[PDB]
Write a new protein. Structure first.
Lengths: 331, 331, 330
């Protein structure tokens, strides 16, 4: 699965500009799906099988990023976050823009005391991007206002863990692709690779509309609270298996679906952990609220350092999640 | 357009009580539309033309305002904001209520020290409206609880700029009315004049449901950051032409639609500017999330002092916006 | 020069562990120096040419970094800075250790409020490094206490500018190495590639002791204050040519050496700029305090985002500096 994960995480796909991710996913799926369509928002919907029960598996293909809001006379850029990227994460980091341009993030401060105050209260107003331009005109040629960027960081293996940008939610995309590659479905299986989750769960809010699903299961990342002084109320851990989301701020999972997943996990002795998340949301909310309502749940990959350029996952949890879905939906 | 703008901005239409504005728009459109309907929430939907492509143009007809929440023994009124009206804008101001009553906004404070602290952290809890009542009973007769009000201020020309209340989004309403008046559409053109945008984008959230649109373009105001110490990360300026919204907190514009608009603008050499807004939202969000999803974008009029009683626009920006839409949708 | 700069900035050389850098400098200089020695601290001292005047050119080969101070039960590392690396620069970054281990820097915070508070007043006590270990036992094997690390970042060209880690002071090293490759020296030219500059100017404090120098010229980075809301009292800019340091907190340059350099630049139409730095120091201090005192000066390469993992220079300034030195000494 490593190469698939490496390819998807490194691909350029911030919210609203996910086309490259969608294409890579389509290619990977060729020969493993019966059909597909791409809707108006850019959601990729694929299907395999002919079983009576219809199930959606959803993962979002957008990642967090930045967008250029202004250019000054000397050619430095200002940016606005796309999704929940912290300004503290950006300091001294490199940004990769859609056209391949690389920029360096710098912070303002006319005095050492001002720099010290700025970092104590960091905001995007105090940040800028240097793309090597020497004038406004030159910067506009390379990266005009409205240009999107992502972390300039890639996949690397760290003593058996995988580290990359955009585990959120390329790791989810990889899980679902892998399910389609392997499964002989007992259900009619719908794969939705949805846009713009990071800016309001937008794609999954409509992707369900044209899909007659009995169930929707969102696959996403969750907080692995096993680091020093981790979020105390969060129980999730690396290598603890798939995390079955009881609740987060966006949704409460269908009890019936969780019980099914739990029974499946116990029967096949798949390691799993229960999740209640005290912040954040997932695409499950979108399917839940579509039409007359699709009962929905979330299965999560425990991930360290979410929204950093070095998100970390345990490959055993990913495999177990693909296994759990396969046992639940087929063979 | 001056008389149309003067008429629309001066009309009484706070969120949920937009009827007078709707009637005016209907009267102005007479002879320029094939048909119209008014839905359950009060959205006004109109159509002209027979083209293959179906396009919605949306402007919201509600304005920010106040609503009466309580009355005291002496006949003074307490109010709650309707939409994002700041208390600071309110002070010393006159409010015009639906039944035509004028009220004066006053602030509490039993000592000069108290008054100073109140203005230091102003809130609606510290404000009251004086409508000349001498008792609760008398006030209850003039402006009972639940009466809606708006700014008592009107249209004025300021050295060639237009100033009025409710440029947001009467200026949007004017643009669409003027498009329908002039255009010979190569498209099927749907005009949606939607209610209750200021209180959660309520109207545009359902107005698309019954309209088989290929595209939706929201016409709304945006922050013109060309005043002293303006919002630094915002690029928009008066006389910079229509602002093509890449993103705001509510939506990311459809890339294809923006590119189409950009090409039209370059080809006909219409002044335009690219917009990323660091706060706020528009009706584009409602259409994006409608049914299976309508690809949507926003085109904005640069406006100074948004949500004040003296919002300011450049007539050239409005005309260029009218021009851009005509070129995009017809001749 | 690009490839020399790319190689040097990417090499592993934090203070006190500069060996890999020293080897590369030696390899590059082969055939361009008459002789060399490495002293007890690891300073690499080289010489070329003969002449009555003896001149030192100095660049430090160490870069800023981190060192492991402790390990917990779950296998996470705590670190201490080596030199002036800000904890804010480390958040979410990757660290490359000497034996090649890669680590991820994370921050503590048991509540969302705590995390915000920690970010508000960040310190090394709030940081940890994740190397993928699942236990202390496993971690001590991979990266025991006392392991050194540097930024895991590399050289990239950004619209005609050079960006990498450790322009400070690899860019100084490349300049001096380049002078040696090109120069036919009119002096006896001493090149000192010194250690532990970032931790108190240690190497340059003694590197001059065994060298009979008339003059010392330190080559180092300086603050390029041409970014938005840059340090307002700093005038130095990219593409402004080499910066002649009148003063910083560590030293005041010899006026005589500065005047010679100014005259050389004027004579040969080399662009240059005057530098006054309100913070920081260079190896020039060490030479001036050596023995009976060696008159010393600093010539600086204008650099943006110093002590970040993405330091930025203009190749024209560097090339102009090589030029200024060749003109002066050969």
């Amino acid at each position: 699965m490593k190469e698939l994960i490496r390819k998807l995480t490194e691909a350029f796909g911030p919210s609203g500009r996910e086309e490259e991710v969608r294409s890579i996913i389509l290619e990977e799926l060729e020969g493993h799906i019966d059909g597909h369509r791409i809707d108006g928002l850019g959601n990729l919907i694929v299907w395999k099988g002919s079983g009576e029960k219809k199930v959606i598996l959803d993962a979002h293909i957008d990642e967090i990023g930045v967008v250029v809001t202004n250019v000054d006379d000397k050619g430095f850029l200002t940016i606005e976050p796309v999704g929940g990227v912290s300004p503290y994460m950006l300091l001294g980091k490199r940004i990769r823009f859609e056209n391949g341009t690389i920029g360096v993030v710098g912070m303002e401060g006319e005095t050492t005391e001002e720099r010290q105050e700025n970092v104590r209260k960091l905001s995007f107003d105090k940040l800028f991007i240097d793309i090597g331009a020497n004038s406004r005109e030159e910067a506009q040629k390379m990266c005009p206002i409205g240009s999107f960027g992502v972390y300039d960081s890639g996949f690397v293996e760290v003593s058996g863990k995988y580290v990359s940008k955009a585990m959120d939610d390329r790791i989810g995309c990889a899980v679902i692709v892998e399910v389609f590659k392997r499964i002989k479905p007992a259900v009619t299986l719908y794969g939705v690779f949805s846009v713009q989750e990071e800016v309001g769960l937008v794609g999954a809010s409509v992707a369900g509309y044209g899909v007659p699903a009995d169930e929707a299961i969102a696959i996403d990342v969750t907080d692995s609270a096993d680091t020093p002084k981790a979020i105390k109320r969060h129980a999730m851990r690396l290598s603890g298996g798939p995390a079955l989301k009881v609740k987060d701020r966006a949704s409460i999972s269908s009890k019936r679906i969780l019980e099914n997943l739990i029974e499946i996990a116990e029967k096949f002795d798949i390691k799993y952990q229960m999740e209640v998340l005290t912040f954040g949301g997932t695409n499950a909310m979108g399917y839940q609220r579509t039409r007359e309502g699709i009962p929905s749940a979330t299965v999560s990959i425990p991930t360290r350092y979410v929204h950093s350029p070095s998100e970390m996952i345990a490959p055993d949890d990913v495999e177990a999640t693909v296994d759990l879905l396969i046992r639940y939906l087929g063979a």
